[PDB]
């Protein structure tokens, strides 16, 4: 019976809430009350990557911590040499509406996607010398929000069809689809051990998925609006989410509940991009107020501000070695902070 | 110097890429980007066919002007997450069907299709991303509007309306309603045209409207607005 199904669902939700409350003894704030404050973090624009002529929507660092791919609505993917400003490649996209870009860990592939609902894998290490489309993954019925490379052959893609998918690059077929979100999934972040990944959607919920199994292991509901950015803690046992409710939250996997929210009264604009630091102490979030705020992870204190963008900060990435922070925005500029 | 031969050649390659990007941006800035919108059965397909997946990009050239029409009707997702991608288009081509005044949607039969079109027009005309993006409003299916207003009255859609059941009065009333749905009439303009299948002047109307939007954008850039 539908009524009895709904009653059982409500009872199970109550049981989950009771378990979460029982597991909650002391919040993260009390435990990290005595730790020394991070201090006023002051970063400066060490590099400005010019050349984009439209709003930059995505940016992914390479594993070498030097190469950087940026996506903008001008229809171009530019691979930047961050150390010395140098456009290594300028890939002309078939569809100029790109809201995500990815860099393979090997560096041989770069993937972009967007309103065309197709994740285009581009090959960089080719004999002809020009970047070419290795594979065009199709099957998503909504706009592509975030794609991340498992390896050279597997990619996990989140779309606005309320589903995430895992693709085989060689076969171009969806190995596994991930369903359960009610709203449009807007971001994903692979775990450091690449076993799991978390996806945040417009349903104000974050879900942790098992890549090999293909079903959701955990759900997290703490936000009051659509989650736009999700990032995984370097430890691999926690993650952070940013939403339009102007608050960032940290979710633990073991405790299955939010640990601490990052909210300020003056912050009214939402969060577009979130990326943790190498040590996990610093949470860098990109807001629509044309600013990036550096947040202490263990303390709900604003460590600093990365102002300098004339429009909304849309993407934010931290290098693997943690020596740079890129915060490309809608003003068609990328800035490498340090 | 302090740059090796390979570093110097890399700088040369970067400069070549910069030149290509500047050329492409100059080419794009001369192109007209039009966002096409509609509510289901509205003649968006007819308009696309007359003026020759998630997004359908139709490019056409008319009077030495390169156009770029983007159709987002097949997205089927939250419009508020990707509608800011189109902030900056020259104009929005909004198509409503005058034959939907008598017809209701498959679901929620209490609500009328023309009222859904009005709701979408209100949502996108008054959206924060489109405050100066002029709307080229199109009222297609005017032949079926003739046939239907001959028999059925407009009271079903708008009960307040009280006028002659001829074409002119009802069409003017619908156009007036859609125009008064525009809250910000000081920074944006609504261009309205009556079309159907057997029309060849639609492309010319869009060209004239875009010419006006370009002139106004130039006036704004020069600061005279």
């Amino acid at each position, epitope marked *: 019976e539908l009524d009895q199904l709904r009653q059982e669902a409500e009872q199970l939700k109550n049981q989950i809430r009771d378990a979460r409350k029982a597991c909650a003894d002391a919040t993260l704030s009390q435990i990290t009350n005595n730790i020394d404050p991070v201090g006023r973090i002051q970063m400066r624009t060490r590099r400005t990557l010019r050349g984009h002529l439209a709003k930059i929507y995505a940016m992914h660092w390479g594993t070498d911590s*030097r*190469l950087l791919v940026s996506a903008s609505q001008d229809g171009k993917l530019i691979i930047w*040499d961050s150390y010395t400003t*140098n456009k*290594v*490649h300028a890939i002309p996209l078939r569809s100029s509406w790109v809201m995500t870009c990815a860099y393979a860990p090997s*560096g041989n592939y770069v993937a972009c996607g967007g309103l065309d609902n197709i994740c285009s894998i581009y090959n960089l*290490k080719t*004999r*002809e*010398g*020009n970047v070419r489309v290795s594979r065009e993954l199709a099957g998503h019925t909504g706009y592509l929000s975030c794609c991340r490379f498992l390896d050279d052959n597997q990619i996990v893609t989140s779309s606005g069809d309320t589903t995430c998918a895992l693709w085989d690059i060689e076969t171009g077929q969806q190995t596994t689809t991930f369903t359960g979100h009610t709203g449009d999934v807007m971001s994903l972040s692979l775990a450091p051990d690449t076993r799991l990944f978390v996806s945040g959607a417009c349903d104000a919920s974050a879900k942790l998925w098992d890549v090999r199994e293909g079903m959701c292991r955990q759900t997290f509901t703490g936000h009051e609006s659509d989650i736009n950015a999700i990032c995984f803690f370097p430890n691999g046992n926690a993650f952070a989410t940013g939403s339009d409710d102007a608050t960032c939250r940290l979710f633990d996997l073991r405790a299955d509940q939010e640990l601490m929210t990052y909210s300020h009264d003056n912050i009214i604009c939402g969060i577009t991009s979130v990326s943790f630091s190498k040590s996990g102490r610093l949470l860098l979030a990109g807001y629509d107020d044309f600013n990036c705020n550096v947040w202490d992870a263990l303390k709900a204190d604003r460590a600093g501000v990365l102002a300098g963008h004339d429009n909304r900060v849309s993407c934010l990435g931290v290098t693997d070695d943690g020596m740079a922070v890129a915060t490309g925005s809608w003003d068609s500029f990328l800035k490498i902070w340090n | 110097c*302090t740059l*090796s*031969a*390979e*570093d*110097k*050649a*890399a700088v*040369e*390659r970067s*400069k*070549m890429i910069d030149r290509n990007l500047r050329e492409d941006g100059e080419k794009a800035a001369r192109e007209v980007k039009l966002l096409l919108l509609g509510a289901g059965e509205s003649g968006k397909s007819t308009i696309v066919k007359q003026m020759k997946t998630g997004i359908v990009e139709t490019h056409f050239t008319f009077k030495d002007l390169h156009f770029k029409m983007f159709d987002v009707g097949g997205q089927r997702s939250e419009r508020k997450k990707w509608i800011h991608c189109f902030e900056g288009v020259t104009a929005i081509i909004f198509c409503v069907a005058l034959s939907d005044y008598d017809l209701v949607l498959a679901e929620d039969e209490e609500m009328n299709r023309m009222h859904e079109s009005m709701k979408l027009f209100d949502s996108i005309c008054n959206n924060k991303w489109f405050t100066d993006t002029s709307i080229i409003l199109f009222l297609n299916k005017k032949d079926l509007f003739e046939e239907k207003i001959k028999k059925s009255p407009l009271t079903i859609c708008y009960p307040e309306y009280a006028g002659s059941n001829t074409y002119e009065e009802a069409a003017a009333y619908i156009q007036c309603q859609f125009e008064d749905l525009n809250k910000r009439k000081d920074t944006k303009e609504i261009y309205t045209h009556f079309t159907c299948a057997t029309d060849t002047k639609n492309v010319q109307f869009v060209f004239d409207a875009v010419t006006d939007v370009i002139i106004k954008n130039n006036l704004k850039d020069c600061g005279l607005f």
Partner: single-chain antibody
Amino acid sequence: VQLVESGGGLVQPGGSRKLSCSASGFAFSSFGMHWVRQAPEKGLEWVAYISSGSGTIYYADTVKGRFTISRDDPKNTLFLQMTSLRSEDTAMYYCVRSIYYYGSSPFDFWGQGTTLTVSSSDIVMTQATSSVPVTPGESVSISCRSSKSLLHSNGNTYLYWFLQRPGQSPQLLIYRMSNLASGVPDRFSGSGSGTAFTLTISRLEAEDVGVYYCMQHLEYPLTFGAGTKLEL
């Protein structure tokens, strides 16, 4: 990827000739182009280089003024106009492609080459090893040393290793003395400290039989070595 070269043949001394390198199978516009000679019984010698877009044109001292290099990008061909030929120019000319970006591989492909027969303060790299007798399964280490340190302030040392099989164009083995070229077996490895360099073959096969050349890219008057000959 094919780089077929035309021209060549007997040329009277003091005459003129034009060498064409027809490029097919890759983006010719985005690749810088090189010209390398090889005397009938000697090593290689760089001649000319034209960059992508023809912005940068560098010649060798022995050919400065006499020779000019140009490319027809739409036609996918590379030219070498040769004027006032001398007996020192009697060599087999190799047309070389080289792309330059971060992590790029220069000098990947060498053409078959054309033989031109004329009738009757730069870095110096020496390979004193000369002829070496080798056996299959052995591990040889070819050593090449440079006049001045090839390490740069950017951290990228700029030594290149090439392989000339008998009757074949040189094939890139190592670039930046650490990086294996695409399509090169893992048995090859390069090491050095900036002035002295090594090329190690852990396992030796009959394909490795040939002569090896060490090249520098720090200063564009590119200099090869004498060429250590490995024989079975």
